[PDB]
């Protein structure tokens, strides 16, 4: 049951994620060097953009945009930087029928950041609109059709190459699996209802939604998704559990709601993590007891793990499974000093969950250890 | 044998201790400088070490120590305003000192604005005493009476949480120490700031070949280099001046929102290997046209100076030369460390030459003009 079918309009996929950061040039360099992206496009003084510098980096279909202000006392960007640290500002969706989505969103009460506008260059035209979501986060809808340019109109090829990024081993991340937003206490349901009402998303039901793990996760979660379930937006709030809630820590250190992690889907997670580790990236410490009590729990299970299990243990890759399939997942250390944003790499084998079984599994290994 | 002014009665500025940057993302900043510029992360302070308000990443390359600092909490007033006003930039030019008391007494007596009066910190490796005074803009000087402290960097710092196999693997860049640190001032402020160094710290004006030359038309700046009595620490002070083009010093002040450090120069004894391996790490530098090297070789025809380094390689790497009859220096400037047109770095090697490359204002301007009009 996906609820009522929206009468026109479609959210095709994640278009890109825009970050507001203190130093967009060094941030782009962090994600190309550490996380396997390559700089794709630029806007700045050199291109006529005199207020904002924008570095676009890409890995297959994953596009991150890093933005910093050129001028002192830019009040909007500055306040966001002082409040949150480096973080996600805009989760952008590629859309069909922008007019229908925007008209509906406006009728249903969305706060409009910028009404429908368009930008053009030699390679075609793209239309946009931007509304607010939780915290300081916004959604830009991008009606890009089959735009043939570099990324978006007005963006130019990077000023310089990067021989270091070019020589480093490829990390094989393909697309954005899901983007997770942490909310303050008691806000999960109202934020989920915003997606249902304003965008006509519906709640996505997975194997995770059928077995509660509140005691070990210290959170509540609802996953909201569009009608075709191509875009997945988990919404968390803090909950009482055995240990301090990570969601409450996020809200305290981020200064309110925001994106806690972005999960990046791969079809070869062993090569991904080997090559990310070669790039100096670090991931959560996983005690070896986790892997003893998984080979044994899998003894009473019929699912067949295709990846070499000793290599999974060596790389500290996690596994969650039911009887019909499984997923592999691993979490980076934080992208900044604040205990706020991190990244996830995930590979799916006939399993639509998000790893909730690992809340209990990891918690007990760390505790026993 | 120069007039270095009155000898200070007590107190010694030994060398640059470290440079502290206030930045938006200190973890990512340290990674920029280790990966791109050849540093190694040395030490850390943060939540995991008991430092609950500030995260600090210390990176080192031989004697060069850079510290990157970010706030942990929302709406940290002091660091927040600095970030919004300046972008990422230098906050503290720290000096290793002897006889802190007399230095601090003299500075306070002469009107230094004190940021933090003398205090001290200790751990299992010993004690270090500090004081901090303001200099130009939002920049400050911490005096570090380091004596012979035995810890990693300073009391309270710990080893980095993780190693970095990428920083470890990359080619060595052979930068040794901080040659000088340049502060850009707004209109008409150069003399006042230079006087502050003479009066408050008992620095004196350092005279070099550059001071005996006419370059304002090409440089669009006026400069005075202040240095400590023993001339181990050099602090050039720039202000805008009318020139043939817009002053880069004026542009700095517009985009930095006031005075601040414009560049830090790092001394090397093998600039060829340094620049080769910085380029291998993806660093970029100013583009220098072939006309520069053609015109330089022509000028050198009337000189007795002997360039030791391979000139074809210097041209290939776009390294600059300035020279007189007794020696020369080699120098090269990175692209900017951030999007705002503010801070950059300099790599410099000296062969019996105490200048700062002022001959290259004319040489580069004229080389670019000849390359266009040809
Ligand atoms: C990294 C924090 N941790 C985390 C995150 C997820 C996750 O990404 C997730 C769960 N539900 N939804 C919708 C998601 O996106 C799953 C398990 C675990 N752990 C065991 S953890 O504490 O290490
Ligand atoms: C990078 C901007 N440029 C620059 C900087 C210096 C320098 O480091 C310097 C000059 N005086 N003092 C005290 C210094 O430290 C010398 C020459 C040139 N150019 C020709 S430049 O426009 O490329
Ligand atoms: Co996830
Ligand atoms: Co210099």
JSON list of N, CA and C in Angstrom, two decimals, chain A residues 165-190:
[
{"chain": "A", "resi": 165, "resn": "UNK", "atom": "N", "xyz": [44.16, 13.07, -7.32]},
{"chain": "A", "resi": 165, "resn": "UNK", "atom": "CA", "xyz": [42.87, 12.38, -7.42]},
{"chain": "A", "resi": 165, "resn": "UNK", "atom": "C", "xyz": [42.86, 11.40, -8.58]},
{"chain": "A", "resi": 166, "resn": "UNK", "atom": "N", "xyz": [43.52, 11.75, -9.69]},
{"chain": "A", "resi": 166, "resn": "UNK", "atom": "CA", "xyz": [43.54, 10.89, -10.87]},
{"chain": "A", "resi": 166, "resn": "UNK", "atom": "C", "xyz": [44.34, 9.61, -10.65]},
{"chain": "A", "resi": 167, "resn": "UNK", "atom": "N", "xyz": [45.37, 9.64, -9.80]},
{"chain": "A", "resi": 167, "resn": "UNK", "atom": "CA", "xyz": [46.17, 8.43, -9.62]},
{"chain": "A", "resi": 167, "resn": "UNK", "atom": "C", "xyz": [45.61, 7.48, -8.56]},
{"chain": "A", "resi": 168, "resn": "UNK", "atom": "N", "xyz": [44.69, 7.94, -7.72]},
{"chain": "A", "resi": 168, "resn": "UNK", "atom": "CA", "xyz": [44.22, 7.16, -6.58]},
{"chain": "A", "resi": 168, "resn": "UNK", "atom": "C", "xyz": [43.23, 6.08, -7.02]},
{"chain": "A", "resi": 169, "resn": "UNK", "atom": "N", "xyz": [43.13, 4.97, -6.27]},
{"chain": "A", "resi": 169, "resn": "UNK", "atom": "CA", "xyz": [42.31, 3.84, -6.74]},
{"chain": "A", "resi": 169, "resn": "UNK", "atom": "C", "xyz": [40.82, 4.16, -6.67]},
{"chain": "A", "resi": 170, "resn": "UNK", "atom": "N", "xyz": [40.10, 3.71, -7.70]},
{"chain": "A", "resi": 170, "resn": "UNK", "atom": "CA", "xyz": [38.68, 4.03, -7.81]},
{"chain": "A", "resi": 170, "resn": "UNK", "atom": "C", "xyz": [37.87, 3.29, -6.75]},
{"chain": "A", "resi": 171, "resn": "UNK", "atom": "N", "xyz": [36.85, 3.97, -6.20]},
{"chain": "A", "resi": 171, "resn": "UNK", "atom": "CA", "xyz": [36.13, 3.46, -5.05]},
{"chain": "A", "resi": 171, "resn": "UNK", "atom": "C", "xyz": [34.76, 2.87, -5.39]},
{"chain": "A", "resi": 172, "resn": "UNK", "atom": "N", "xyz": [34.27, 3.04, -6.62]},
{"chain": "A", "resi": 172, "resn": "UNK", "atom": "CA", "xyz": [33.15, 2.24, -7.13]},
{"chain": "A", "resi": 172, "resn": "UNK", "atom": "C", "xyz": [31.84, 2.49, -6.36]},
{"chain": "A", "resi": 173, "resn": "UNK", "atom": "N", "xyz": [31.61, 3.74, -5.99]},
{"chain": "A", "resi": 173, "resn": "UNK", "atom": "CA", "xyz": [30.32, 4.15, -5.44]},
{"chain": "A", "resi": 173, "resn": "UNK", "atom": "C", "xyz": [29.45, 4.66, -6.59]},
{"chain": "A", "resi": 174, "resn": "UNK", "atom": "N", "xyz": [28.18, 4.25, -6.62]},
{"chain": "A", "resi": 174, "resn": "UNK", "atom": "CA", "xyz": [27.35, 4.46, -7.80]},
{"chain": "A", "resi": 174, "resn": "UNK", "atom": "C", "xyz": [26.28, 5.52, -7.64]},
{"chain": "A", "resi": 175, "resn": "UNK", "atom": "N", "xyz": [25.47, 5.47, -6.58]},
{"chain": "A", "resi": 175, "resn": "UNK", "atom": "CA", "xyz": [24.35, 6.40, -6.45]},
{"chain": "A", "resi": 175, "resn": "UNK", "atom": "C", "xyz": [24.00, 6.56, -4.98]},
{"chain": "A", "resi": 176, "resn": "UNK", "atom": "N", "xyz": [23.16, 7.55, -4.69]},
{"chain": "A", "resi": 176, "resn": "UNK", "atom": "CA", "xyz": [22.74, 7.80, -3.31]},
{"chain": "A", "resi": 176, "resn": "UNK", "atom": "C", "xyz": [21.61, 6.83, -2.94]},
{"chain": "A", "resi": 177, "resn": "UNK", "atom": "N", "xyz": [21.88, 5.99, -1.94]},
{"chain": "A", "resi": 177, "resn": "UNK", "atom": "CA", "xyz": [20.87, 5.02, -1.51]},
{"chain": "A", "resi": 177, "resn": "UNK", "atom": "C", "xyz": [19.79, 5.69, -0.68]},
{"chain": "A", "resi": 178, "resn": "UNK", "atom": "N", "xyz": [20.18, 6.53, 0.28]},
{"chain": "A", "resi": 178, "resn": "UNK", "atom": "CA", "xyz": [19.21, 7.22, 1.13]},
{"chain": "A", "resi": 178, "resn": "UNK", "atom": "C", "xyz": [19.94, 8.34, 1.86]},
{"chain": "A", "resi": 179, "resn": "UNK", "atom": "N", "xyz": [19.15, 9.31, 2.34]},
{"chain": "A", "resi": 179, "resn": "UNK", "atom": "CA", "xyz": [19.68, 10.45, 3.08]},
{"chain": "A", "resi": 179, "resn": "UNK", "atom": "C", "xyz": [18.89, 10.57, 4.38]},
{"chain": "A", "resi": 180, "resn": "UNK", "atom": "N", "xyz": [19.59, 10.55, 5.51]},
{"chain": "A", "resi": 180, "resn": "UNK", "atom": "CA", "xyz": [18.97, 10.45, 6.83]},
{"chain": "A", "resi": 180, "resn": "UNK", "atom": "C", "xyz": [18.96, 11.81, 7.52]},
{"chain": "A", "resi": 181, "resn": "UNK", "atom": "N", "xyz": [17.79, 12.22, 7.99]},
{"chain": "A", "resi": 181, "resn": "UNK", "atom": "CA", "xyz": [17.66, 13.45, 8.75]},
{"chain": "A", "resi": 181, "resn": "UNK", "atom": "C", "xyz": [17.31, 13.24, 10.22]},
{"chain": "A", "resi": 182, "resn": "UNK", "atom": "N", "xyz": [18.18, 13.70, 11.11]},
{"chain": "A", "resi": 182, "resn": "UNK", "atom": "CA", "xyz": [17.92, 13.64, 12.54]},
{"chain": "A", "resi": 182, "resn": "UNK", "atom": "C", "xyz": [17.09, 14.83, 12.97]},
{"chain": "A", "resi": 183, "resn": "UNK", "atom": "N", "xyz": [16.03, 14.57, 13.74]},
{"chain": "A", "resi": 183, "resn": "UNK", "atom": "CA", "xyz": [15.16, 15.60, 14.29]},
{"chain": "A", "resi": 183, "resn": "UNK", "atom": "C", "xyz": [15.31, 15.69, 15.80]},
{"chain": "A", "resi": 184, "resn": "UNK", "atom": "N", "xyz": [14.94, 16.83, 16.40]},
{"chain": "A", "resi": 184, "resn": "UNK", "atom": "CA", "xyz": [14.89, 16.92, 17.86]},
{"chain": "A", "resi": 184, "resn": "UNK", "atom": "C", "xyz": [13.75, 16.08, 18.41]},
{"chain": "A", "resi": 185, "resn": "UNK", "atom": "N", "xyz": [13.74, 15.94, 19.74]},
{"chain": "A", "resi": 185, "resn": "UNK", "atom": "CA", "xyz": [12.71, 15.16, 20.42]},
{"chain": "A", "resi": 185, "resn": "UNK", "atom": "C", "xyz": [11.32, 15.50, 19.89]},
{"chain": "A", "resi": 186, "resn": "UNK", "atom": "N", "xyz": [10.51, 14.46, 19.69]},
{"chain": "A", "resi": 186, "resn": "UNK", "atom": "CA", "xyz": [9.08, 14.55, 19.41]},
{"chain": "A", "resi": 186, "resn": "UNK", "atom": "C", "xyz": [8.76, 15.06, 18.01]},
{"chain": "A", "resi": 187, "resn": "UNK", "atom": "N", "xyz": [9.76, 15.25, 17.14]},
{"chain": "A", "resi": 187, "resn": "UNK", "atom": "CA", "xyz": [9.50, 15.84, 15.83]},
{"chain": "A", "resi": 187, "resn": "UNK", "atom": "C", "xyz": [9.41, 14.83, 14.69]},
{"chain": "A", "resi": 188, "resn": "UNK", "atom": "N", "xyz": [9.72, 13.55, 14.92]},
{"chain": "A", "resi": 188, "resn": "UNK", "atom": "CA", "xyz": [9.75, 12.59, 13.81]},
{"chain": "A", "resi": 188, "resn": "UNK", "atom": "C", "xyz": [8.43, 12.54, 13.06]},
{"chain": "A", "resi": 189, "resn": "UNK", "atom": "N", "xyz": [7.32, 12.37, 13.78]},
{"chain": "A", "resi": 189, "resn": "UNK", "atom": "CA", "xyz": [6.02, 12.19, 13.12]},
{"chain": "A", "resi": 189, "resn": "UNK", "atom": "C", "xyz": [5.62, 13.41, 12.32]},
{"chain": "A", "resi": 190, "resn": "UNK", "atom": "N", "xyz": [5.76, 14.61, 12.89]},
{"chain": "A", "resi": 190, "resn": "UNK", "atom": "CA", "xyz": [5.36, 15.80, 12.15]},
{"chain": "A", "resi": 190, "resn": "UNK", "atom": "C", "xyz": [6.22, 16.00, 10.91]}
]
